[PDB]
Curated annotation (Swiss-Prot), chain A:
UniProt-recorded name of the protein: Proteasome subunit alpha type-4
NCBIfam families per the UniProt record, alphabetical: PRK03996.1
Top-rank lineage group of the source organism: Eukaryota
Gene label: PSMA4
Organism: Homo sapiens
Keyword match Acetylation: yes
Gene3D superfamilies for the chain: Glutamine Phosphoribosylpyrophosphate, subunit 1, domain 1
Role, per record: Component of the 20S core proteasome complex involved in the proteolytic degradation of most intracellular proteins. This complex plays numerous essential roles within the cell by associating with different regulatory particles. Associated with two 19S regulatory particles, forms the 26S proteasome and thus participates in the ATP-dependent degradation of ubiquitinated proteins.
SUPFAM superfamilies: N-terminal nucleophile aminohydrolases (Ntn hydrolases)
Similarity comment: Belongs to the peptidase T1A family.
GO CC list: cytoplasm; cytosol; extracellular exosome; intracellular membrane-bounded organelle; nucleoplasm; nucleus; P-body; proteasome complex
Swiss-Prot record, chain D:
Pfam family, one: Proteasome_A_N
Cellular component aspect of the GO annotation: cytoplasm; cytosol; extracellular exosome; nucleoplasm; nucleus; proteasome complex; proteasome core complex; proteasome core complex, alpha-subunit complex
GO biological process: proteasome-mediated ubiquitin-dependent protein catabolic process
Subcellular location: Cytoplasm; Nucleus
Subunit-structure text: The 26S proteasome consists of a 20S proteasome core and two 19S regulatory subunits. The 20S proteasome core is a barrel-shaped complex made of 28 subunits that are arranged in four stacked rings. The two outer rings are each formed by seven alpha subunits, and the two inner rings are formed by seven beta subunits. The proteolytic activity is exerted by three beta-subunits PSMB5, PSMB6 and PSMB7. Interacts with AURKB. Interacts with CDKN1A. Interacts with MDM2 and RB1. Interacts with the C-terminus of TBXA2R isoform 2. Interacts with DNAJB2. (Microbial infection) Interacts with HIV-1 Tat protein.
Native organism: Homo sapiens (Human)
Residues bearing PTM Phosphoserine: 238
Protein name (record): Proteasome subunit alpha type-3
Residues bearing PTM N6-acetyllysine: 52, 201, 225
Major subcellular location class: cytoplasm
GO terms for MF: ubiquitin protein ligase binding
InterPro entries named among the record's database cross-references: Ntn_hydrolases_N, Proteasome_alpha, Proteasome_alpha-type, Proteasome_asu_N, Proteasome_sua/b
Family assignment from sequence similarity: Belongs to the peptidase T1A family.
From Swiss-Prot, chain E:
Family statement: Belongs to the peptidase T1A family.
UniProt-listed CDD domains: proteasome_alpha_type_6 (cd03754)
Protein keywords: Acetylation, Cytoplasm, Glycoprotein, Nucleus, Phosphoprotein, Proteasome
SS bonds (residue pairs): none
Pfam families per record: Proteasome (PF00227), Proteasome_A_N (PF10584)
Descriptive protein name: Proteasome subunit alpha type-6
Residues modified to Phosphotyrosine: 155
PANTHER family to which the protein is assigned, alphabetical: PROTEASOME SUBUNIT ALPHA/BETA
Gene name of the encoded protein: PSMA6
In-chain residues carrying the UniProt-annotated modification Phosphoserine: 13, 59-60
UniProt GO BP: positive regulation of canonical NF-kappaB signal transduction; proteasome-mediated ubiquitin-dependent protein catabolic process; proteolysis involved in protein catabolic process; regulation of inflammatory response
UniProtKB/Swiss-Prot annotation, chain H:
Name of the protein described by the UniProt record: Proteasome subunit alpha type-7
Residue positions, PTM N6-acetyllysine: 226
N-terminal signal peptide: none
Gene name of this polypeptide: PSMA7
Residues with attached carbohydrate: 129
Induction trigger: Down-regulated by the ribozyme Rz3'X. Up-regulated in colorectal cancer tissues.
Family (UniProt): Belongs to the peptidase T1A family.
Family matches, as CDD domains: proteasome_alpha_type_7 (cd03755)
Subunit structure: The 26S proteasome consists of a 20S proteasome core and two 19S regulatory subunits. The 20S proteasome core is a barrel-shaped complex made of 28 subunits that are arranged in four stacked rings. The two outer rings are each formed by seven alpha subunits, and the two inner rings are formed by seven beta subunits. The proteolytic activity is exerted by three beta-subunits PSMB5, PSMB6 and PSMB7. PSMA7 interacts directly with the PSMG1-PSMG2 heterodimer which promotes 20S proteasome assembly. Interacts with HIF1A. Interacts with RAB7A. Interacts with PRKN. Interacts with ABL1 and ABL2. (Microbial infection) Interacts with HIV-1 TAT protein.
Location in or out of the cell: Cytoplasm; Nucleus
Lineage: Eukaryota, Metazoa, Chordata, Craniata, Vertebrata
Species of origin: Homo sapiens
Post-translational modification: Phosphorylation by ABL1 or ABL2 leads to an inhibition of proteasomal activity and cell cycle transition blocks.
GO annotation, biological process: proteasome-mediated ubiquitin-dependent protein catabolic process
């Protein structure tokens, strides 16, 4: 019985460990998600993958998952492993609300899940999750927040990050076009359609190929709005009008 | 006794779960089956050939009902199918004892696919070797979902599972539109199962089940002979 | 040899090698000799040491007032069966208020040590128990082995270089069932000088004697009270 | 190779070698025969004197399970008396729950399912013992069963387990066990185990006999000394 | 066609196969045995052979026909130790149907519960999946007689004529030419067409001491095993 | 290739018990000497860095008021055995209202030393000396990773163990005094260690019949060194 | 008794295309008020409320266990909860404590979300649902509220006369009770808007 | 339950999975800690931030209590769970014995938690090393370290992580008695060592002191800009 054990927990002789690096190797391919904020509001831009002509296009979202009443997440990686995590921190936020009668702060929801994710990399002889995912949300302590999880179990706060297939190309351009605290929730939308114009090799930016959801703070609402397919393409062509203007005049 | 308590499904150095990739090979070598929803109900049709004339075809069934209004077919290996049928029969009851309501078809696939994902990570087990097609008409609108041994699921308009499934999906793409009745979808489900069957497609080589707003039911071989007649 | 790894695996010849390797562990410890008369049961051990200033490792232990044992092998598994041995004697004395018979004690050991010789990832007990005791039927000498096979005998010897001691016991066992306690002991003491190199024999600090007797509680003699028994032996012929 | 390490794997032609390897360990134990007469069962075991130092009456390969049921074993002796403990314990649960003495078609059924249970898993090994069960009842007559390490049991008019198995059961079918009572059987049981085991392999050996029937009033016990001395008187007339 | 430990435990090959199960189907064939079951218009007949190679063995304890419930009988192929363990489960599962549900278990519901248990052995990578087969017969109300087979993979189907064992394919080729000409089947014709199945495949033309026949009919729904005298009555009428 | 942790050798001993015997040859050396006046017991520290605080490490630690200890090999898993010994001497005082003898402390630890496996996970890689004064006078015991203990009179354990034992068999006799046994030990430690001998590289402790377990400190210790 | 330890009264009443619910405001311990703003009606989504009356511990306990199970329902499913569905949910929660029971009696009133149809029901302390068509009442002063509602209820009532009927039903019955009072709050819902009113009652 | 010995002995007497865990420590960012007589000085080097993103979530100097600070190196996933388990034991200590937790007591809980975790089944050992710095009762400032095998060990100065022995050799020739004269003088003792490490050009350094009566106080990149101005100015006029 010890001949068949694969030892998914031990170190390697060079010091690092192989199992989560194979998972973060798989997190590169198969998906593209990004977020941005500088002011009132925060967005999640995600690219759809299965664009076959025979699907029902239901469940209000594809890679966006509403977690709390004022925060949501975008996921990347193995989709079946994602469904277990998404309905796991969904009731971490509810057992907080049962205990304190107050909505959960957005940061310590991430730390609670990233401790469950860390435990499989550390004992049990168990396959870790090949899932990395984003976090938007609002709380009264710091306002609009943006986090990023990794399959190793370590998180981080950010301002704009992509976990796509060409995510290094996206990050290299996000730190080429940015402004700290002045990107309103229209310039960020124009910047969002600019970034996934680059990283998507399928050109011309099909409006059914991407999904965009915004979280804006209305007084006691915190409206999480998945914007429909009638206002994507007018935002698509708005990027197209200015690029023919800027190329010809230069 | 006891178990093994270690996962025998690990990540490859290329980042692919190899045992799930092998389980999809067993699904592709199964019996062909198609499923079509069209605007008032869903048609599930499969292909059941006994190996010889000695078998009693009225003994087992491919098309199974889950509740009053949910049916379920497969394309994979036999004995794995009857396990997660009896699992899904039970899951529809614990929803009913809490809420006093027939389960939505979406929430069943939420919980059947959660079993299959849980079964490909736990210790000492090989994954399932079946893929499913689930129908049902909840709140007027019909539904057609497909799961897989990995634990994911989709929302199809029309799809095919089994051998030559890549040829059926090209055939359904040139056939299906938004506007068909239930009896039209029956006629094009036999027309796509004729792509891969043998020469004789009789009243007992196939098995068809439908949903309406009247509920799920399974066709007897009398009217299956009438649909098989005047076909192709 | 891939058939040489776990206790579960049978050989293609049909001999489990992990049991046969635990027989090699009992052949490493020093020799000890047990024998019995009509009315007595005497076992004699031979200690060893590491340096000349370290003390000698004892081998004869006291289980009960009418049962004593002698060990050979690794000492940690010896105390594991010893604390099982003491426990099974005093609870029978707690329940039935009687001395637990010897032949019924050893069958509890044979069922105890057979269990880890069949499971997975479980070693055998490497130990060399020679048991001397009293039933209502007189003296008894029993030996065990890590194959969980206990033997009824009248004189045996186990440990390193013990085949030379067995040849001495065969050609003198016609005399054993008659003699008193005095030359019953020094019959056994002539077996321990057989299993030694030809220069050192019995220097009153490496030998121990334990006797249970028909009106005599089990008594261990150590390195001063050995000297009355040890005197009265002739020189080694050369 | 690799197909024969655990008992949980079949071979590429569909058989388990860990059971077959444990069957090979039985033919290094010596010989145990047992035949049933018209009105009882007589066991017989020839016992190798390994050295002079052992005591006459040691390490008996012939057990006593219940008041009427007997056992003669052949194999690795530690597993022999371990199977003898559960069979002795199984008959106690029958009398405590159902009130009466256990029949042999049920007793050998419960033991063989316990032996079969270790031929399935990787955590345990198969037993290395084969043994015989014989008894007598006043309502059922004499019974005689035999169990291999795989877990298969059958009825027998006479059987043999040990080193020379075919060389023992060749002469058993020369007898007529249907009509002989269990008195002249005792002389014929001993005679067919003197002709086996040539004196080149062993120097000297020990006869051990057992005995059950209504002549023993249903209870199982050993033969008396004088009767087995008559069989040992009937030893050295096989030289003609 | 192989990668990893897919030859050793029950996981998937790269081709989608899994070899430990299809190794176990040819563990049935090592018994050296072949059984035939034929369903009639108002009866069900199981016929199988028995091979007794010894005179010293009790021929009444080698029956592969087993009575599961009062109205359900079965025949066992494959190795003997696994087959008798599977009969013990089927006796236990039928009694729990009656205690929980208050009526006699249908024979297809019993074959489902056996096949669900056998599924779990090829579903965990620890247990050895019981290389023996299973054929049941029985009378059901508003269904008449019906015959079912359960294999060690967890598959089952209702048949009209059934073969299992070494000569399975040669027997089924004989029977499929017999059934598709669609003669009506009385009681004795199903007895005649089942004996002449394994008499022409095996080419024996035997005497009644080597086969054994169980039967059920809708006038006496008790599963009953035929006496050798009335086996001989059907046999001498088979030789016209 | 990979055995289990519980496997016999063809020569019959074990694998990982015998491997743990090799592990205590990397530890710092330690000397204990039994004398009828009392038990003296010394060690080196093996100071690595000048920036290191020297007194934070220890090898002599007390079990009870009349029993001291000395550890070698690994250190981090020695603290598990020390805590089981301290609790055991207090359960014996609680239930019997007396002091546990020095020998009976050792077998209470030695039963724990070989209990690893796969149920209820490796042998301990330390070696211990137990010096104490019970009612039979001063005692000195030595246990093993194998769990085998035996009373010694002058035992030297560590990386320089076999080099010190040979130089210790020549100077020991049964009628020593404690004042010369302390001096005889630091002559041996002066040879075997790497750095020079001072009041910070070593430390001592003596147990007496009269007073309790006393550990020397850096004021009364260097009068032995300057008068070596 | 146990239900008389804190008092309380909850009334629901069905109208034409609208439904109203009312409760008292007193919190006290057997003779002694503590505050006059104790919440006993809790919102469960839009156009669907719940009233609780009984022991003051289990009023705040069940109203937090139910909200724990409600938000998990409205996120796992993409829709809001039907009023008939919540009745089965609350009855499941109380029957789990069949032998450790919560001492409260819930009252559920709301509109069906798609077809705006009123719904009322009430439950005992171990979960026996009872749907009616006119009114449900719960609390200590139950019998005084039956004499009001059987004498004043009309079948098809606009929201103006529905408010005036349930107001006179509460003010006259709770004044006849001793351990209930100190103000009455009235929620009256309908398909377009919702209305919270507090009445001028005896602070006596 | 997954029951399997992970850490076993070697044929020469070592532990493979322990000495593999010490390599993972040797590629984490460098943390340096010294101690004074009234104020302690500790600060990680190689912050390596993206410098357009968040920074208050990436801190590697936290507090176990009001009197105990703790820096670390190695992989940060296994580090913030040892801290959260240490924040409970020091809080449950106050429910027992009334004093605040001494700096010696909290190191023994971490080191014993790490040793028994190299003993159990199915568990890879921790891949972190830490420096526990505190000022206990009666005002005695001292620090410690912790090896991944669980050997707590006091010091007067320390440096762990990638590029440690290059600093550890530098500190012993740099540690004098008069370097711990003032508070800001000992801060320049740290700033020279981290400048003798991976780059640390003022924006990649982050120091934090404790005046034995305060909480932990991080200076923003204005005093480190001021200190590296005057530590480099003293080097520019001496040489």
């Amino acid at each position: 019985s010890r001949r068949y054990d694969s030892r998914t927990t031990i170190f390697s002789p060079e010091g690092r460990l192989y199992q989560v690096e194979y998972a973060m190797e798989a997190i590169g391919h198969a998906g593209t998600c990004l977020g941005i904020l500088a002011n009132d509001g925060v967005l999640l831009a995600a690219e759809r993958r299965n664009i076959h002509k025979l699907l029902d296009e239901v469940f209000f979202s594809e890679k966006i998952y509403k977690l709390n009443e004022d925060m949501a997440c975008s996921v990347a990686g193995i989709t079946s492993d994602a469904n277990v995590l998404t309905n796991e921190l969904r009731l971490i936020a509810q057992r907080y609300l049962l205990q304190y009668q107050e909505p959960i702060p957005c940061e310590q929801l991430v730390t609670a899940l990233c401790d469950i994710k860390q435990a499989y990399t550390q004992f049990g002889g168990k396959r870790p999750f090949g899932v990395s995912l984003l976090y938007i949300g609002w709380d009264k302590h710091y306002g609009f927040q943006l986090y990023q999880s990794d399959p190793s179990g370590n998180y981080g706060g950010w301002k704009a990050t992509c976990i796509g297939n060409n995510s290094a190309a996206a990050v290299s351009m996000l730190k080429q076009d940015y402004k700290e605290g002045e990107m309103t929730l229209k310039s960020a939308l124009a910047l969002a359609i600019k970034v996934l114009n680059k990283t998507m090799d399928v050109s011309k930016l099909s409006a059914e190929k991407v999904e965009i959801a915004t979280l804006t703070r209305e007084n006691g609402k915190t409206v999480i709005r998945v914007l429909k397919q009638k206002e994507v393409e007018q935002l698509i062509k708005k990027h197209e009008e200015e690029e023919a203007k800027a190329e010809r005049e230069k | 006794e006891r178990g093994y308590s270690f996962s025998l499904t690990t990540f490859s150095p290329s980042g692919k779960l190899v045992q799930i990739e092998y389980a999809l090979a067993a699904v592709a070598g199964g019996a062909p089956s198609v499923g079509i929803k069209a605007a008032n109900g869903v048609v599930l049709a499969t292909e059941k050939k006994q190996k010889s004339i000695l078998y009693d075809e009225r003994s087992v069934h491919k098309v199974e009902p889950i509740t009053k209004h949910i049916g379920l077919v497969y394309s994979g290996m036999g004995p794995d199918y009857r396990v997660l049928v009896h699992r899904a029969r039970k899951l529809a009851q614990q929803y009913y004892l809490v809420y006093q309501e027939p389960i939505p078809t979406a929430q069943l696939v939420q919980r059947v696919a959660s079993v299959m994902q849980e079964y490909t990570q736990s210790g000492g087990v090989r994954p399932f070797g079946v893929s499913l097609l689930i129908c049902g008409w909840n709140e007027g609108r019909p539904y057609l979902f497909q799961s897989d041994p990995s634990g994911a699921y989709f929302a199809w308009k029309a799809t095919a599972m089994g051998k030559n499934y890549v040829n059926g999906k090209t055939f359904l793409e040139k056939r299906y539109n938004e506007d068909l009745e239930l009896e039209d979808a029956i006629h094009t489900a036999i027309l796509t199962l004729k792509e891969s069957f043998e020469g004789q497609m009789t009243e007992d080589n196939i098995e068809v089940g439908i949903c309406n707003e009247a509920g799920f039911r399974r066709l007897t071989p009398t009217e299956v002979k009438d649909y098989l007649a005047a076909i192709a | 040899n891939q058939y040489d790894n776990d206790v579960t695996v049978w050989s293609p010849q049909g001999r489990i090698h992990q049991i046969e390797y635990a027989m090699e562990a009992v052949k490493q410890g020093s020799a000890t000799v047990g024998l019995k008369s009509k009315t007595h049961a005497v076992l004699v051990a031979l200690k060893r040491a590491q340096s000349e200033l370290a003390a000698h490792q004892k081998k004869i232990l006291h289980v009960d007032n009418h049962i004593g044992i002698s060990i050979a092998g690794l000492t940690a598994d010896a105390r594991l069966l010893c604390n099982f041995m003491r426990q099974e004697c005093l609870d029978s004395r707690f329940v039935f208020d009687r001395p637990l018979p010897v032949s019924r004690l050893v069958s509890l050991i044979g069922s105890k040590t057979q269990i880890p010789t069949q499971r997975y990832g479980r070693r055998p007990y490497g130990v060399g128990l020679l048991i001397a005791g009293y039933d209502d039927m007189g003296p008894h000498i029993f030996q065990t082995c890590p194959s969980a096979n206990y033997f009824d005998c009248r004189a045996m010897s186990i440990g390193a270089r013990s085949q030379s001691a067995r040849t001495y016991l065969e050609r003198h066992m016609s005399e054993f069932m008659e003699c008193n306690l005095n030359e019953l002991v020094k019959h056994g003491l002539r077996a321990l000088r057989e299993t030694l190199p030809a220069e050192q024999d019995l220097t009153t600090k490496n030998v121990s004697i334990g006797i249970v007797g028909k009106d005599l509680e089990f008594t261990i003699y150590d390195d001063d009270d050995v000297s009355p028994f040890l005197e009265g032996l002739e020189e080694r012929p050369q | 190779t690799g197909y024969d390490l655990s008992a949980s794997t079949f071979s590429p032609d569909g058989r388990v070698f860990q059971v077959e390897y444990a069957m090979k360990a039985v033919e290094n134990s010596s010989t145990a025969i047992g035949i049933r007469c018209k009105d009882g069962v007589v066991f017989g075991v020839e016992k190798l004197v390994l050295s002079k130092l052992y005591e006459e009456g040691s390490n008996k390969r012939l057990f006593n399970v219940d008041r009427h049921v007997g056992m003669a074993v052949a194999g690795l002796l530690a597993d022999a008396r371990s199977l003898a403990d559960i069979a002795r314990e199984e008959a106690s649960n029958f009398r405590s729950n159902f009130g009466y003495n256990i029949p042999l078609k049920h007793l050998a059924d419960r033991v063989a399912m316990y032996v079969h249970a270790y031929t399935l898993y990787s955590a345990v090994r198969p037993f290395g013992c084969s043994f015989m069960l014989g008894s007598y009842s006043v309502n059922d007559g004499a019974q005689l069963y035999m169990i291999d390490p795989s877990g298969v049991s059958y009825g027998y008019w006479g059987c043999a387990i040990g080193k020379a198995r075919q060389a023992a059961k060749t002469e058993i079918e020369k007898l007529q066990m249907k009509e002989m009572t269990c008195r002249d059987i005792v002389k014929e049981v001993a005679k067919i185990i003197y002709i086996v085991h040539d004196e080149v392999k062993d120097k000297a050996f020990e006869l051990e006999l057992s005995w059950v029937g209504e002549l023993t009033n249903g209870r199982h016990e050993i033969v008396p000394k004088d009767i087995r001395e008559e069989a040992e008187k009937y030893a050295k007339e096989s030289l003609k | 066609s192989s990668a990893g430990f897919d030859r050793h435990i029950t996981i998937f090959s790269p081709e989608g196969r899994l070899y430990q199960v299809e190794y176990a189907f040819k563990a049935i064939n090592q018994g050296g045995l072949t059984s035939v079951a034929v369903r009639g218009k108002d009866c069900a007949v199981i016929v199988t052979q028995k091979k007794v190679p010894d005179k010293l063995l009790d021929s009444s304890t080698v029956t592969h026909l087993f009575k599961i419930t009062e109205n359900i009988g079965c025949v066992m192929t494959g190795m003997t130790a696994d087959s008798r363990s599977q009969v013990q489960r089927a006796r236990y599962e039928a009694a729990n149907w009656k205690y929980k549900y208050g009526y006699e278990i249908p024979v297809d519901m019993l074959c489902k519960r056996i096949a669900d248990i056998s599924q779990v052995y090829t579903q965990n990578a620890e247990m050895r999946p019981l290389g023996c087969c299973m054929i049941l017969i029985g009378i059901d109300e508003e269904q008449g007689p019906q015959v079912y087979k359960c294999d060690p993979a967890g598959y089952y189907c209702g048949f009209k004529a059934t073969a299992a064992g070494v000569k399975q394919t040669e027997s089924t080729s004989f029977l499929e030419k017999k059934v598709k000409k669609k003669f009506d089947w009385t009681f004795e014709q199903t007895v005649e067409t089942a004996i002449t199945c394994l008499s022409t495949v095996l080419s024996i033309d035997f005497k009644p001491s080597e086969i054994e026949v169980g039967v059920v009919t809708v006038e006496n729904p008790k599963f009953r095993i035929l006496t050798e005298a009335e086996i001989d009555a059907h046999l001498v009428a088979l030789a016209e | 290739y990979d055995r289990g942790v519980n496997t016999f050798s063809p020569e019959g001993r074990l694998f990982q018990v015998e491997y743990a015997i090799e592990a205590i040859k990397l530890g710092s050396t330690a000397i204990g000497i039994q004398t009828s006046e009392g038990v003296c017991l010394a060690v080196e520290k093996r100071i690595t860095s000048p920036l290191m605080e020297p007194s934070s490490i220890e090898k002599i630690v007390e079990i009870d008021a009349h029993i001291g200890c000395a550890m070698s090999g690994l250190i981090a898993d020695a603290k598990t055995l020390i805590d089981k010994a301290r609790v055991e001497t207090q359960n014996h005082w609680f239930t019997y209202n007396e002091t546990m003898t020095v020998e009976s402390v050792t077998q209470a630890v030695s039963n724990l030393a070989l209990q690893f496996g796969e149920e209820d996970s490796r042998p301990f890689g330390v070696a211990l000396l137990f010096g104490g004064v019970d009612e039979k006078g001063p005692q000195l015991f030595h246990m093993d990773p194998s769990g085998t203990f035996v009373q010694c009179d002058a035992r030297a354990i560590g990386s320089a163990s076999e080099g010190a034992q040979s130089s210790l068999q020549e100077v020991y006799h049964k009628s020593m005094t404690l004042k010369e046994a302390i001096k005889s030990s630091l002559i041996i430690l002066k040879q075997v260690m790497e750095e020079k001998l001072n009041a910070t590289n070593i430390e001592l402790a003596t147990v007496q019949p009269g007073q309790n377990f006393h550990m020397f400190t850096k004021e009364e210790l260097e009068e032995v060194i300057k008068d070596i | 008794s146990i239900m008389s330890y804190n008092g309380g009264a909850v009334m629901a009443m069905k109208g034409k295309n609208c439904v109203a619910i009312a409760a008292d405001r007193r919190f006290g311990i057997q003779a002694q008020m503590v505050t006059t703003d104790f919440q006993k009606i809790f919102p469960m989504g839009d156009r669907l409320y719940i009233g609780l009356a009984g022991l003051a511990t289990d009023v705040q306990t069940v109203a937090q266990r139910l909200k724990f199970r409600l938000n998990l329902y409205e996120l796992k499913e993409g829709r809001q909860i039907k009023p008939y569905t919540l009745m089965s949910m609350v009855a499941n929660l109380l029957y789990e404590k069949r032998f450790g029971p919560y001492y409260t009696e819930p009252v559920i009133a709301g509109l069906d979300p798609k077809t705006f149809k009123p719904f009322i029901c009430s439950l005992d302390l171990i979960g026996c649902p009872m749907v009616t068509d006119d009114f449900v009442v719960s609390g200590t002063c139950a019998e005084q509220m039956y004499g009001m509602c059987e004498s004043l209820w009309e079948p098809n009532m606009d929201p103006d006369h529905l408010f005036e009927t349930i107001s006179q039903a509460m003010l006259n019955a709770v004044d006849r009770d001793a351990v209930s009072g100190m103000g009455v709050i009235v929620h009256i819902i309908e398909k377009d808007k919702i209305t919270t009113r507090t009445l001028k009652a005896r602070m006596d | 339950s997954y029951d399997r010995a992970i850490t076993v002995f070697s044929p020469d007497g070592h532990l493979f999975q322990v000495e593999y865990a010490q390599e993972a420590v040797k590629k984490g960012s460098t943390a340096v800690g010294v101690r004074g007589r009234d104020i302690v000085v500790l600060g990680v080097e190689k912050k390596s931030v993206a410098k357009l993103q968040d920074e208050r979530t990436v801190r590697k100097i936290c507090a176990l209590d009001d009197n105990v600070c703790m820096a670390f190196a190695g992989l940060t996933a296994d580090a913030r769970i040892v801290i959260n388990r240490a924040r409970v034991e020091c809080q449950s200590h106050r429910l027992t014995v009334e004093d605040p937790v001494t700096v010696e007591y909290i190191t023994r809980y971490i080191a014993s938690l790490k040793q028994r975790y190299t003993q159990s089944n199915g568990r890879r050992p921790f891949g972190i090393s830490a420096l526990i710095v505190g000022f206990d009762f009666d005002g005695t400032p001292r620090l410690y370290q912790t090896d991944p095998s669980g050997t707590y060990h006091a010091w007067k100065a320390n440096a762990i992580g990638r590029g440690a022995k290059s600093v550890r050799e530098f500190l012993e020739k740099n540690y004098t008695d008069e370097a711990i004269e003032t508070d800001d003088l000992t801060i320049k003792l740290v700033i020279k060592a981290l400048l003798e490490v991976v780059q640390s050009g003022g924006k990649n350094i982050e120091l934090a002191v404790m005046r034995r009566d305060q909480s932990l106080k991080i200076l923003n990149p204005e005093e480190i800009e001021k200190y590296v101005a005057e530590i480099e100015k003293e080097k520019e006029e001496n040489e």
